[PDB]
Task: structure prediction
Amino acid sequence: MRHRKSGRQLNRNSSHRQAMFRNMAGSLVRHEIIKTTLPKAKELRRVVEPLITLAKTDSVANRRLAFARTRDNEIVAKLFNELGPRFASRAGGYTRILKCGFRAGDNAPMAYIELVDR
Amino acid sequence: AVQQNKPTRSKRGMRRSHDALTAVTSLSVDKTSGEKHLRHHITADGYYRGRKVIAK
Amino acid sequence: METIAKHRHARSSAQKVRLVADLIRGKKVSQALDILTYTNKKAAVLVKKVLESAIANAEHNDGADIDDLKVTKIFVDEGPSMKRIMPRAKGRADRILKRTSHITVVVSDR
Amino acid sequence: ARVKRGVIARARHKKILKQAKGYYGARSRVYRVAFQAVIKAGQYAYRDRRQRKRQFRQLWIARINAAARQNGISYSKFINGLKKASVEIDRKILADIAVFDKVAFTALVEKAKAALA
Amino acid sequence: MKRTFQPSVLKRNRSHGFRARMATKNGRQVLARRRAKGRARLTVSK
RNA sequence: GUGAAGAGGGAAACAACCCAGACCGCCAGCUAAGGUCCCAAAGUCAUGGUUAAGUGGGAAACGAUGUGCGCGGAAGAUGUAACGGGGCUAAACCAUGCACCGAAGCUGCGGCAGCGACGCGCGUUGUUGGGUAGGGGAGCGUUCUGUAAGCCUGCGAAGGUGUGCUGUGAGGCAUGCUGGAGGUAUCAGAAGUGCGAAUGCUGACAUAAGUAACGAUAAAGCGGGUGAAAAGCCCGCUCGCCGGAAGACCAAGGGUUCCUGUCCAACGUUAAUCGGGGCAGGGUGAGUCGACCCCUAAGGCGAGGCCGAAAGGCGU
RNA sequence: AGGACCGAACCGACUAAUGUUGAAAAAUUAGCGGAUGACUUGUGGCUGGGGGUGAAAGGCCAAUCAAACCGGGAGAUAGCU
RNA sequence: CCCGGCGAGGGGAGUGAAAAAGAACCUGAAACCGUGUACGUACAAGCAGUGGGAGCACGCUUAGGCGUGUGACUGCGUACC
RNA sequence: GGUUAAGCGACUAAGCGUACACGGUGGAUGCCCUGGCAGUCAGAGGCGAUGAAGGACGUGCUAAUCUGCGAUAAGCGUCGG
Ligand SMILES: [Mg+2]
Ligand SMILES: [Mg+2]
Ligand SMILES: [Mg+2]
Ligand SMILES: [Mg+2]
Ligand SMILES: [Mg+2]
Ligand SMILES: [Mg+2]
Ligand SMILES: [Mg+2]
Ligand SMILES: [Mg+2]
Ligand SMILES: [Mg+2]
Ligand SMILES: [Mg+2]
Ligand SMILES: [Mg+2]
Ligand SMILES: [Mg+2]
Ligand SMILES: [Mg+2]
Ligand SMILES: [Mg+2]
Ligand SMILES: [Mg+2]
Ligand SMILES: [Mg+2]
Ligand SMILES: [Mg+2]
Ligand SMILES: [Mg+2]
Ligand SMILES: [Mg+2]
Ligand SMILES: [Mg+2]
Ligand SMILES: [Mg+2]
Ligand SMILES: [Mg+2]
Ligand SMILES: [Mg+2]
Ligand SMILES: [Mg+2]
Ligand SMILES: [Mg+2]
Ligand SMILES: [Mg+2]
Ligand SMILES: [Mg+2]
Ligand SMILES: [Mg+2]
Ligand SMILES: [Mg+2]
Ligand SMILES: [Mg+2]
Ligand SMILES: [Mg+2]
Ligand SMILES: [Mg+2]
Ligand SMILES: [Mg+2]
Ligand SMILES: [Mg+2]
Ligand SMILES: [Mg+2]
Ligand SMILES: [Mg+2]
Ligand SMILES: [Mg+2]
Ligand SMILES: [Mg+2]
Ligand SMILES: [Mg+2]
Ligand SMILES: [Mg+2]
Ligand SMILES: [Mg+2]
Ligand SMILES: [Mg+2]
Ligand SMILES: [Mg+2]
Ligand SMILES: [Mg+2]
Ligand SMILES: [Mg+2]
Ligand SMILES: [Mg+2]
Ligand SMILES: [Mg+2]
Ligand SMILES: [Mg+2]
Ligand SMILES: [Mg+2]
Ligand SMILES: [Mg+2]
Ligand SMILES: [Mg+2]
Ligand SMILES: [Mg+2]
Ligand SMILES: [Mg+2]
Ligand SMILES: [Mg+2]
Ligand SMILES: [Mg+2]
Ligand SMILES: [Mg+2]
Ligand SMILES: [Mg+2]
Ligand SMILES: [Mg+2]
Ligand SMILES: [Mg+2]
Ligand SMILES: [Mg+2]
Result:
């Protein structure tokens, strides 16, 4: 039973999941489009979009939350200086998931996830 | 535990009666590029719903 | 005019390739290429190459045009098996059969 | 004078397997199983050449009984009467008549009834 | 697990080598037998 | 007596009980045991009695105003389940009778064979023909030798694979296709002469099964490159793991695995562009490191020697 | 000082679980015992099968031991299958 | 020449008497595995046959039944050594 | 005629079976013999300190291996064919 539970385990333990989504959020912010498996993209929405919302309000405390999250000043700077203002009016849905077939190596369902204003 | 009797080619075929692959029902055709693709998947040329979504 | 392409000693067991072969038997070759393109099997790539080779053979050697061609006959036969030894516990050796197969596609216009 | 058994063995095996055509599974493919199947089939055929006569006599009697009781007499009395009338038509012919000539079988029934009366 | 064969070229040559075989008549008979059988390698030497 | 070494019919099923001893064929008949309501062939037969208990269709001691054979006694565990079942008040029980069914028994018709008698190998005739161990008789087929420098065969041999015909059988003949150079009558001769079993031997191929598993739970993510194709290769940025080791250097051991270019069949438990894989080329530079060398330890060998059938043992 | 104590390396192998067509023909995991000694370890040497060696278990002597392995007598013998 | 990865493999062309003699090469059996066709099979219980047997399909040449394939249904029927 | 009712009823094959056709796998069979097996008639019955048997390494226009050969190295001289 997993009634009403949320969040995919992705065959990883909690620390690995957290680290992987930290990395993947960084990649998505810096490249604005990344190709990942469909479940990872779907879980990545829930990690990246809250970062962008946080970046909407620029403050020292917000930047330190966005750094505690994502652990990257490159990424934090890009968030608060570009993505925050780029998405200043848009209420949610900063990302777009485009299914793109299957990975050759293992037949994984692949998907492009990108910022909507790229 | 293991069989006592070699199962027949008949029983092997009966078990495999559910192993057949299902072909894709039909492909979608992008309104702009005209390329066929899986529905809800981008085309090989990076189109989706008439939009060039990925360059190259 | 029937036209044949074979892929002998295809490195895949005939049972795995027959699943893909069943999809396109009797199909129009354009429909067959569509089906094989979106079949997520290794055998799909193998069979698709055989089918494209058959279509090209028909066009070039026999003068047929692709729009009329149907996959008239498709069958996969067992090829020779490569025999390998995969060690198990307690010094017991098990034999691995690395099965191959012969993919034959016959396209015809009638 | 070494003798290789290949051709003769192939001939015997081929002969049995030819006799085993139609049998299910290994019984038509596999000589050990096919030979058993062919022997059991010959055994059955020998037994049935006898049983065929019993089954057909039983069928003829059943049809004669049906037709006689259509004409108002049981098979027991019908056959007894035909014995009394010195009528020697056998059950095969009697059953054929019962199926194909209701009038001729009615004549036979009347002849038997007269003999029993 | 320590397995039974623990190679040592010195011990190998001393216990089974050509000169060890030649040292005794029984070794010399080993060599004669291996020559009679036509062995490509008479001893562990080569 | 039967089975063993005996089929058939009955007793539901049921080696050994009952009937009956299968030479073969028949879509003829009569019977045996046993049966005749339906399953399931044949009597819902006839006559005259009994039973009321479903007794029949499991059983005593004993007990009962049953009736002209019936009652209780009489309880078991998967499911009726102690008639073969349905069902039966006769379709139960008893007697009598006539029918019919019923076997591979008997008869009929056709065929084969053995043995014997009579007459000249033939005829006639009688009879016989289940069969294990086993005895006797007669054959088939295979390889080889002679016949045979013959005969058949590129106008297609052997082999393979069908088909037809043929014989009691082993088998034989013909012929289509395949095959592409051998085969071999006949009568003799000799055998590595016939395979389904030996937990047989070897090779091949199945089965379980596209199942288990893919070998440490240290962990990956993304971008770019190359490529036919990239989860795994290269580059980059993160990420995580070891850090008295999972780092570094050697010895032993191994032997080219080292480096470069190239390739991706096989090998790599997946893919592979990558590799300790294939292929080609390159690479190991010593007075000082090490070996060799000089010196000995344990120990070995050991001129002579001592000992011992010989071999050899010990030893200066 | 110590066949002293606790405890890593190192040596062992008491318990349990796993594994038991294993990752492994004896391990792994967590605990455990010794850990200056009758300790442990490298290299080399010696002891040879009715023999060796044995703080002794019929233990060990190349995954083999109430008599190693290999070749031979040998196609032993088998009233058994 | 063509498909294919400057593949593997294949199809043509050509050689050849013959590439279905193409080097994984004479003949190419059987197990085993397929494709196509005919028939049967999803209310049916068991050595899978045999006796009877409809239907269907096919090949037929007194136009008639015959041959072949299958085998609904049914009697009987517990492999071999 | 249509509707209704009742009764009966083919057409399905996921797969499977049987038959046939065509294949695959496999390497039987036939045919073949530069290999063996057993002999007969002869021969020679040894080779070695003038360095044997047997090897290692080398030796070519040579990368390997085989055959030959030995730093004079697939060979050198001489006599004969
Ligand atoms: Mg929810
Ligand atoms: Mg997983
Ligand atoms: Mg943690
Ligand atoms: Mg068993
Ligand atoms: Mg399945
Ligand atoms: Mg091992
Ligand atoms: Mg011979
Ligand atoms: Mg067959
Ligand atoms: Mg006995
Ligand atoms: Mg009997
Ligand atoms: Mg019976
Ligand atoms: Mg008799
Ligand atoms: Mg009846
Ligand atoms: Mg009762
Ligand atoms: Mg009583
Ligand atoms: Mg009670
Ligand atoms: Mg009960
Ligand atoms: Mg009668
Ligand atoms: Mg009879
Ligand atoms: Mg008789
Ligand atoms: Mg007899
Ligand atoms: Mg011959
Ligand atoms: Mg001859
Ligand atoms: Mg023999
Ligand atoms: Mg036998
Ligand atoms: Mg299973
Ligand atoms: Mg499972
Ligand atoms: Mg699994
Ligand atoms: Mg792994
Ligand atoms: Mg990448
Ligand atoms: Mg990885
Ligand atoms: Mg990296
Ligand atoms: Mg190498
Ligand atoms: Mg390297
Ligand atoms: Mg691979
Ligand atoms: Mg590939
Ligand atoms: Mg390499
Ligand atoms: Mg000394
Ligand atoms: Mg000495
Ligand atoms: Mg001396
Ligand atoms: Mg202490
Ligand atoms: Mg110990
Ligand atoms: Mg547990
Ligand atoms: Mg431990
Ligand atoms: Mg202590
Ligand atoms: Mg301690
Ligand atoms: Mg003891
Ligand atoms: Mg041991
Ligand atoms: Mg002894
Ligand atoms: Mg002896
Ligand atoms: Mg023996
Ligand atoms: Mg090619
Ligand atoms: Mg030839
Ligand atoms: Mg061939
Ligand atoms: Mg075949
Ligand atoms: Mg019902
Ligand atoms: Mg039905
Ligand atoms: Mg069943
Ligand atoms: Mg039955
Ligand atoms: Mg079929």
Chain D has one domain: 1-117.
